[PDB]
Design a protein around this ligand. Structure first.
Ligand SMILES: OC[C@H]1O[C@@](CO)(OC[C@H]2O[C@@](CO)(OC[C@H]3O[C@@](CO)(OC[C@H]4O[C@](O)(CO)[C@@H](O)[C@@H]4O)[C@@H](O)[C@@H]3O)[C@@H](O)[C@@H]2O)[C@@H](O)[C@@H]1O
Ligand SMILES: OC[C@H]1O[C@@](CO)(OC[C@H]2O[C@@](CO)(OC[C@H]3O[C@@](CO)(OC[C@H]4O[C@](O)(CO)[C@@H](O)[C@@H]4O)[C@@H](O)[C@@H]3O)[C@@H](O)[C@@H]2O)[C@@H](O)[C@@H]1O
Ligand SMILES: [Mg+2]
Ligand SMILES: [Mg+2]
Lengths: 924, 924
């Protein structure tokens, strides 16, 4: 049962959602909804990025979740998703407009479990899972690193014995004169102090482990004619594959409703409390682990943490970083409550007053221990940072609804007034100069150094007046008209309020009398919708020219703190220096709402006695007057960024969902759910400065206007130079040599320069598809979900340090194993460029070499279960007893062009592990 | 129905509690419970101090509240007391031992409302009240202040015109030579800059207002055979009489219970969330208002805040202080949840697992604005202090109970394991050097001055194993035996655990067959109890020798910060100075539990068909091995304080409760509830240093051992010297003169010295009584509650600055009106000493002059209500509709000896106002 019946509505089967056993219900529906992209890195929390109907705006694209009628934008990883009864996604502007003013990026409706009338039930779910690392990046060992360094040295013509890294090479020349390596030897200690012995260390294995996930839920519901109630307690814990990273969550949900005065009066409430404690991996931990060479031992001779010495590259120990970061635990309390009252003066009139509250508390204590890893140290810096953050959102809604059933005409008229208020604040203290260096002793009162205080606050408000009218004729013709008047505190008084209309039409062809003989065609409906929605998801202080007294107490990297504090006297400090103000941004009083117009056409069909159902959708989204933050022209200096309505986004998309469920003669019930979606995005208008800096694409070389959002311009790599004759024949370029990347001459001017660039990267897949198979046979239920993406290109940063030697910010870094298969006179059948120590050809530039085919098809979740027969369960008095074993991310298929692994996450972010889970469900 | 039936249990009628309309339910029962003292200053919050059975320990005496089986010690002002169904107070150690290990100071049982089976109900309560200031302290106006100053000057023999305060006196001598004042004149401006004009300002009226209190509660309950539920929403707001002080609170409570598996399994939960925002009055605001003379204007000539100039005393403007303190608003979130599960393997066995959580969050932002009030200023100091505090308590309880009903013998055997864990933390940031000086701009990131960070954390744990056995023979002989094994983390391993037994006996005389003819005697029961309880309410870090790195970042008054930071180089600062550690206290590994033995004897009677009921109780409490924090001997220096078991407290008390309810021929129902209680406290053992410093009494002159706790030693004032002959006849003393206080010579040595002191102050009332009258007549209900205290002495600090001139730390301060009635040759019929400018006689010493009779009798709450007749309510479909008007603290009677006002609060704390309230109750 769709709650709109005339728009693009996707209903998610919650039974399959809980089968995957994911903490975040959103992450479970990664590819089960057409026109919906869910990206998850794989960290222990269920945090993920959601994109509905592609990218339709230049500001934040987070969709507006709605739970029990309360809107929000926070992630669902911090909420208990196991007590969800129904999930509805509103991807159409006309359908989602009536649910709030923040429906620009789509609306997701989440309904919590409630006690069913006339029965009382309980459900206890237990789940234990083991997570194993699968995308183990292959890196060179000590011998492989030495061989690669020797190959680079001999390719560059330098003496390999002058590496000054403890490597002694016994090598010679073959008959053809190509250098050949016979053997290598290493000094026992990398330094002259004999404190860092050489060893073969698997850093990826050292920093990874086998995580343990435990989930325990207990829900009880009780219904009655005078009311109903529901109480759920949930516990979740996930240990990440990366060491010293974990996330656990307690959840308590209480829902109830009461009917008084012979069903005239109703009072209901839905409340939930969550407590999530998490230790997160440090930024770029995978990058640090990959960069550090395997020759560095984990522990030194004296038992201290190992580190680079002498000429080894300046890379911190990933194991020591994880050990020091294990105490950076943050606690998050989530408060999601709602109380509603409903009154019915007569049969057709309803008045609902609803109050919703969302209170978020975050407390963190970050520690900075003194470390000395060889030549890497922080000069004995020890510090503590105690941070507190508060978020408070409250919403009040007044709804008046009238329904009439006169003749064959059904008419619903609803009006509503909504008020939203959000207030955010944060404050933190910083202390230094500790002695014991333990979490127990590291408190700000126990410090003896410089102390700093930080603190900020902000907020906004929303006012909405909405009206919805629905007309139904003969249960065959449906018309919907809605109007919205929305205002926000982020705009000036002149442009505070804006009006948004939406219209929807629907015709049930199967109800027409001219096809009564079509018994096979059970149902057929054609619907169209044209709607307008408003977007204002911008900075709260957007229309004000912001001047702030940035003294310079905030930590900055590279010294570009831009603080305002100068020793005008010239006493080299010693006190409070004079301060001032700096401009953060230039205000603009002409900013207004961003108008997104959505046109949707849908065909819903159901054939063979409601067995073969499906829907086909075509949508066109056009966003104009987009509030974009343009940067300064260059001479305007600091604070030149300002918000302006100079954007234009276009999205043309197709979606197709199909489902076929049927039994079998011998007792097998098979249900197949197929889904496919495609979309095309385009940028039509953009400010000149934004197109020049290329923040939305183009890399600052060409304007992204007229091209897909996120498209990147780069060079074209036409293979590599296999001979000097090839170098001479090709157009002249800087750094051209044998074994180097050959760049195509686009304009045929005879020289390779900055103008030989074209559009090479397009982050738009050809189509994303999903397939869910459910089989029931003799109390055995098997679930199998496949998700695939075809026609998508990906930029691989791992390739930059796996296909080249010394292609990073620093040299002598550890590289990938496939680097051993580089081009050489001995091995001419290779496409990887020859190893070198100097990047004369400048191979770090953006080109088609780093663009790979991201197409993949992976088994997201497979589950085999056994249900106890009813007679045994009744003998044990149990209503239901089930067991199941599942595998998540067990198998995947990638393209041959993709040289790396894990096409979903081809970057240095958190890896995606394989989960093996065993679970039980009891229905006492 | 008492939940112990064999111990000292007080049942509080909740219907009368809600009649008073107080935010704190505890404050409502100020004198309705025998042997229970409730002290409330009168601030907008319902904060109050509770003492059960007198003072029985030298450490914190706060009783252990229990709500829904969850123990706590936080005040009930932050919780919603309007949803309470029953209140039980356990003042006996034997009865309260089984409810927790913190029952040393008594246990209060609070039960929340639950849905009654088979019905569904709603109650809406509205209340609007006005609070008016009644205890307006009388202070001298400009003319009265000038007259008093002239009288003091002429009494001291100095020239009154040399006061240098702008007062010019035209005065002369009478026939007898006594000076007489004819007239006075004042300069228009108190300063030479003509910026502070003279005016007659009523500071008490200026800083006080008429407060408004609003209360709105809405509760709904629904019961069924399969479970029950209850949901309550409450809002309270109180504006204090002192300006810029207020307290509001939102409360949401959800209770539910479910019965599954044919009543074998039960799952229940009780949860409440509270949000209290409060701005409190600054410390000593009443004292500051009284001290400042009335001649100081509220506003200066230029419109700025007025302040003293020239020779006027250094007193800050109370109105300006209140105006600057209005932004010191703190927010407090309270989380009180509990979930329990019960299983019955068969008829007589029960297993209960209960988990309770108490989470408290406090966020405050204190502002320090730059002020310049005449000569009073802070050198333009502006600062912000952002403080965050977290408290987290969690308790787990496992209870196994068995009941047998064999023959005439009833046997209950219960065992239980309880675990408690409390963790507290706090951190704050401090910033300075602000420019705009508004709450919006005052944030730590916006500051430009020195920043400080403070932070601390602590906690403790409790483990308890308890067993209770109850035996009943013929429903006539009752025996109870309980044993407790309690351990805490605050002690060492050797003395971690302690054992506490308790025994109770009871005999129902009315059940004996030898008095079957006593029809009038409906019921008579004699009970006795002897129990032992453990007390460990001490500092968490009590057994450790504490060394802390107190750098000196904490604000201190007078410069005694005791920080550890010295400029050993001698560069006058300019950086981080070297620091160290200091000893806070000396540890003691021999500390153990404090053992309190309570012996109670009770007689419960009920006569005339359960119409005249009552109870008489006698209790003896003996606390030994009391954990007291003794100070250093004097040469031990800092950190000499340590915890030791060297205390002994004795309490002998009597209580009597009576109640008579009866109807009348013409239709009047009268219920009278009388209560009386008395107690005597004594200290038997105490450490020598504690007795020497006199922290528990004696004022450091004589040991408090063998005397009542809090007793004070002082001189004896035998009137005043009315002539020189009286001075000559009396024993010689320093400062003796005509009109000065005469001090009795106790030892008859002929000279008044420090040894002429005796016990003068005893803070033990002779008896405290209460009387509640409830009258019902023709739908009119009248409630009248009187509370009286007799035989209590009070030390009046107001007298020190109302009966003397220049008796404070500084001179020329405003004094009371009664100071005008001082002794003089013109007015010899007076007991107030003659005015003087020099305290040669040293009248500031503790003496019987400042000891007054604190006996009082006040109408705590009177309420007249009208209930709509049932037929009209049914016509309007309402189940109940009632209105009421009430007065709180309307009338009081004091003793003639008490020269001041408000005997309950005779100090400079928050005043107690008169409340006039109108309320309505609706039962839809
Ligand atoms: O600084 C960028 C870098 O650091 C992070 C934190 O690791 O961001 C710092 C700030 O992000 C905040 C502000 O909301 O929250 C993000 C983290 O807190 C969590 C807790 O659940 O999310 C809070 C809440 O806000 C979102 O993150 C945004 O809508 C939602 O996803 C979520 O519901 C957690 O998910 C985030 O890690 C604030 O807490 C930090 O000060 C990272 O975000 C980023 O990588
Ligand atoms: O410094 C003494 C003087 O100042 C007060 C605050 O005005 O105490 C200062 C510190 O007391 C703290 C520590 O708990 O709380 C007291 C105030 O906060 C409130 C908020 O509801 O109470 C908090 C919580 O702790 C109790 O006070 C003790 O168990 C409980 O009553 C209550 O549940 C509020 O009631 C108090 O005013 C801390 O907040 C301050 O830093 C006063 O206590 C005292 O007069
Ligand atoms: Mg070219
Ligand atoms: Mg003497």
């Amino acid at each position: 049962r769709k709650a709109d019946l005339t728009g693009a509505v996707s209903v998610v089967k919650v039974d399959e959602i809980q089968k995957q056993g994911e903490n975040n219900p959103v992450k479970a529906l990664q590819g089960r909804v057409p026109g919906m992209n869910i990206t998850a890195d794989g960290n222990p929390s269920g945090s993920a990025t959601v994109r509905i109907r592609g990218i339709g705006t230049l500001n934040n694209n987070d969709p507006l979740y709605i739970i029990d009628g309360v809107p929000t934008k926070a992630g669902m990883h911090e909420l208990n998703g196991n007590d969800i009864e129904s999930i509805q996604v509103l991807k159409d502007a006309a359908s989602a407009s009536i649910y709030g003013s923040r429906a620009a990026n789509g609306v997701i409706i989440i309904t919590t479990k409630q006690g069913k009338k006339g029965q009382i039930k309980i459900n206890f779910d237990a789940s234990v899972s083991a997570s194993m690392y699968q995308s183990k990046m292959n890196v060179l060992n000590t011998e492989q690193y030495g061989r690669a360094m020797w190959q680079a040295y001999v390719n560059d013509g330098e003496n390999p014995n002058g590496n000054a890294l403890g490597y002694a090479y016994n090598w010679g020349y073959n008959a053809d004169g190509n250098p050949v390596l016979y053997g290598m030897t290493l000094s026992k200690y990398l330094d002259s102090k004999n404190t860092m012995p050489v060893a073969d260390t698997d850093w990826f294995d050292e920093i990874t482990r086998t995580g343990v996930i435990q989930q325990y839920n207990l829900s009880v519901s009780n219904g009655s004619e005078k009311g109903s109630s529901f109480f759920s307690l949930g516990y979740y814990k996930n240990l990440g594959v990366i060491k010293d990273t974990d996330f656990d969550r307690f959840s308590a949900r209480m829902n109830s409703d009461y009917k008084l005065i012979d069903d005239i009066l109703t009072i209901g409430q839905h409340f939930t409390l969550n407590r999530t404690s998490e230790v997160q991996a440090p930024g770029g931990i995978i990058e640090t682990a990959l960069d550090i060479p395997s020759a560095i031992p984990v522990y030194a001779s004296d038992g201290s943490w190992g580190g680079p010495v002498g000429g080894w590259p300046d890379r911190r120990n990933p194991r020591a970083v994880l050990e020091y970061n294990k105490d950076n635990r943050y606690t998050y309390w989530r408060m999601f409550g709602d109380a509603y009252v409903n009154l019915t003066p007569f049969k057709g009139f309803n008045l609902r007053s609803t109050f919703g509250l969302d209170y978020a508390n975050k407390q963190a204590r970050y520690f900075t221990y003194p470390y000395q890893e060889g030549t890497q140290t922080n000069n004995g810096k020890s510090a503590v940072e105690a941070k507190q953050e508060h978020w408070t959102k409250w919403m009040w809604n007044a709804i008046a609804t009238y329904q009439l059933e006169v003749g064959k005409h059904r008419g619903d008229v609803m009006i509503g007034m909504e008020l939203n208020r959000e207030d955010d604040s944060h404050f933190s203290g910083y202390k230094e100069d500790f002695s014991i260096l333990t979490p127990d002793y590291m408190w700000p009162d126990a410090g003896s150094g410089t102390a700093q205080a930080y603190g900020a606050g902000e907020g906004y408000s929303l006012v909405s007046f909405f009206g919805k009218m629905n007309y139904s004729y003969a249960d065959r013709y449906l018309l919907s008209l809605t109007l919205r008047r929305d205002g926000s505190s982020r705009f000036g008084k002149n442009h505070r309020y804006a009006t948004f209309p939406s219209v929807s039409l629907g015709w049930r062809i199967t109800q027409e009398n001219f096809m009564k003989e079509l018994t096979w065609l059970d149902d057929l409906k054609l619907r169209a919708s044209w709607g307008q929605t408003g977007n204002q998801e911008i900075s709260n202080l957007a229309r004000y020219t912001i001047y702030a007294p940035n003294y310079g107490t905030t930590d900055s990297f590279g010294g570009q703190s831009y603080g305002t504090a100068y020793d005008i006297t010239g006493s080299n400090g010693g006190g409070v220096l004079p301060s001032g103000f700096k401009r953060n941004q230039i205000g603009n009083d002409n900013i207004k709402w961003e108008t997104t117009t959505q046109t949707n056409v849908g065909i819903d069909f159901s054939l063979f006695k409601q067995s073969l159902y499906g829907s086909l959708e075509y949508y066109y989204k056009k966003a104009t007057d987009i509030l974009t933050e343009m940067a300064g022209v260059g001479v305007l200096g600091e604070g030149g960024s300002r918000w302006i309505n100079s954007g234009a986004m276009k999205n043309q998309g197709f979606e197709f969902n199909l489902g076929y469920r049927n039994k079998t003669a011998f007792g097998l019930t098979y249900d197949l759910n197929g889904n496919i979606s495609t979309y095309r995005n385009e940028i039509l208008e953009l400010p000149e400065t934004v197109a020049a800096n290329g923040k939305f694409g183009g890399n600052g070389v060409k304007s992204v206007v007229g091209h897909t959002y996120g498209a990147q311009v780069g060079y074209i790599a036409d293979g590599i130079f296999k001979s000097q004759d090839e170098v001479d024949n090709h157009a002249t370029q800087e750094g051209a040599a044998v074994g180097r990347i050959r760049y195509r001459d686009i304009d045929h001017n005879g020289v390779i320069d900055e103008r030989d660039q074209n559009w090479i990267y397009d982050p738009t897949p050809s189509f994303s598809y999903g397939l869910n198979i459910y089989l029931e046979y003799k109390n055995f239920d098997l679930t199998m979900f496949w998700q695939g993406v075809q026609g998508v290109d990906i930029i691989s940063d791992v390739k930059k340090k796996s296909d080249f030697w010394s292609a990073s910010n620093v040299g002598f870094l550890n590289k990938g194993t496939r680097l051993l298969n580089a081009w050489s006179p001995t091995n001419p059948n290779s496409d990887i460029p020859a190893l070198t120590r100097s990047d004369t050809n400048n191979e770090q530039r953006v080109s088609t070499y780093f663009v790979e085919n991201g197409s993949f098809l992976k088994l997201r979740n497979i589950q085999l279960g056994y249900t106890v027969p009813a007679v045994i369960s009744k003998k044990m008095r149990m209503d239901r007893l089930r067991f199941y074993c599942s595998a998540q991310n067990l198998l995947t298929i990638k393209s041959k062009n993709f040289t790396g692994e894990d096409p979903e996450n081809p970057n240095f972010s958190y890896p995606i592990p394989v989960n093996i889970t065993f679970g039980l469900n009891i229905g006492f």
